Amino acid sequence: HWGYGKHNGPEHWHKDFPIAKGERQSPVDIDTHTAKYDPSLKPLSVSYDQATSLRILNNGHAFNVEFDDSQDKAVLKGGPLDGTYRLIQFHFHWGSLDGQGSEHTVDKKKYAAELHLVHWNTKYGDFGKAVQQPDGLAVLGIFLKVGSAKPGLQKVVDVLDSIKTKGKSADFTNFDPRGLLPESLDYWTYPGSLTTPPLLECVTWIVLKEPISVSSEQVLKFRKLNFNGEGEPEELMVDNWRPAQPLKNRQIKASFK
Numbered sequence: 050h051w052g053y054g055k056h057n058g059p060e061h062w063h064k065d066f067p068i069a070k071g072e073r074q075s076p077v078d079i080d081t082h083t084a085k086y087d088p089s090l091k092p093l094s095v096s097y098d099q100a101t102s103l104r105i106l107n108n109g110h111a112f113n114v115e116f117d118d119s120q121d122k123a124v125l126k127g128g129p130l131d132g133t134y135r136l137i138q139f140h141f142h143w144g145s146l147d148g149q150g151s152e153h154t155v156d157k158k159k160y161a162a163e164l165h166l167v168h169w170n171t172k173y174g175d176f177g178k179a180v181q182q183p184d185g186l187a188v189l190g191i192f193l194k195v196g197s198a199k200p201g202l203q204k205v206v207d208v209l210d211s212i213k214t215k216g217k218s219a220d221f222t223n224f225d226p227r228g229l230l231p232e233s234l235d236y237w238t239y240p241g242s243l244t245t246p247p248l249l250e251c252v253t254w255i256v257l258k259e260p261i262s263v264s265s266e267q268v269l270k271f272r273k274l275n276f277n278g279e280g281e282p283e284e285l286m287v288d289n290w291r292p293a294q295p296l297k298n299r300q301i302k303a304s305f306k
């Protein structure tokens with residue numbers, strides 16, 4: 050039922066998923082002046098050398114690039130985290146226009162898109178069990194601005210036409226997610242939730258300060274995807290972002306400055 054339209058978009062989600070009005074929902078606006086520098090935060094450890102991508106899927110809300118997470122091959126740890134989190138998938142949120150599309154905002158600035166690298170805590174054995182825990186997931190969020198192309202994104206853009214509609218998938222091996230990271234790993238961090246239903250409050254968010262650049266042609270190709278299935282009327286997959294939610298009783302911490 051849920052999606053991103055007038056009739057089933059974010060302002061409606063709370064009727065099926067009441068935690069939508071919960072105490073630690075995401076995304077949020079990152080007020081850079083009020084984020085607290087925490088000199089005890091560690092450098093983030095991103096260990097993606099052995100990543101095994103498997104498949105790319107149009108799930109009707111975004112596209113997911115999925116990884117083999119049955120061994121410690123692409124892991125996140127350090128930063129604010131206590132254990133080891135395994136990469137399971139990444140996906141993006143983007144706009145119908147370059148001036149919107151990100152979920153998190155920075156001093157109310159919206160980026161053109163936002164990449165989410167989703168990882169689950171190995172102490173819970175699998176993703177489905179991890180999402181039921183308050184420290185189950187760690188999502189590395191990276192902003193995209195439009196400018197020069199991101200060469201490491203082009204393999205993803207080029208397969209999109211093979212997964213245009215809801216439920217399509219394609220083999221997607223040997224994709225290296227290191228090609229999507231900016232130079233700096235400086236970040237903000239706070240406790241939050243999935244940004245899509247079921248909106249579970251299981252995520253440590255780690256949002257990088259430095260955006261990556263992608264070209265206008267690369268983001269245009271995202272906008273040609275479809276939320277509908279094949280043989281259904283065409284609804285362009287655009288504006289699949291949830292707006293900023295109340296910060297409530299939380300403090301955003303900065304690893305820098």
Ligand SMILES: NS(=O)(=O)c1cc(C(=O)Cn2cnc3ccccc32)ccc1Cl
Pocket residue numbers: 108110113165167186188242243244245246247252
């Ligand atoms: N947007 S996000 O908070 O990074 C996040 C998003 C998701 C998904 O959207 C995964 N996902 C894959 N098929 C789906 C069908 C309905 C809802 C979610 C679905 C799963 C985990 C995380 Cl952490």
Ligand SMILES: [Zn+2]
Pocket residue numbers: 140141142165244
């Ligand atoms: Zn997401």
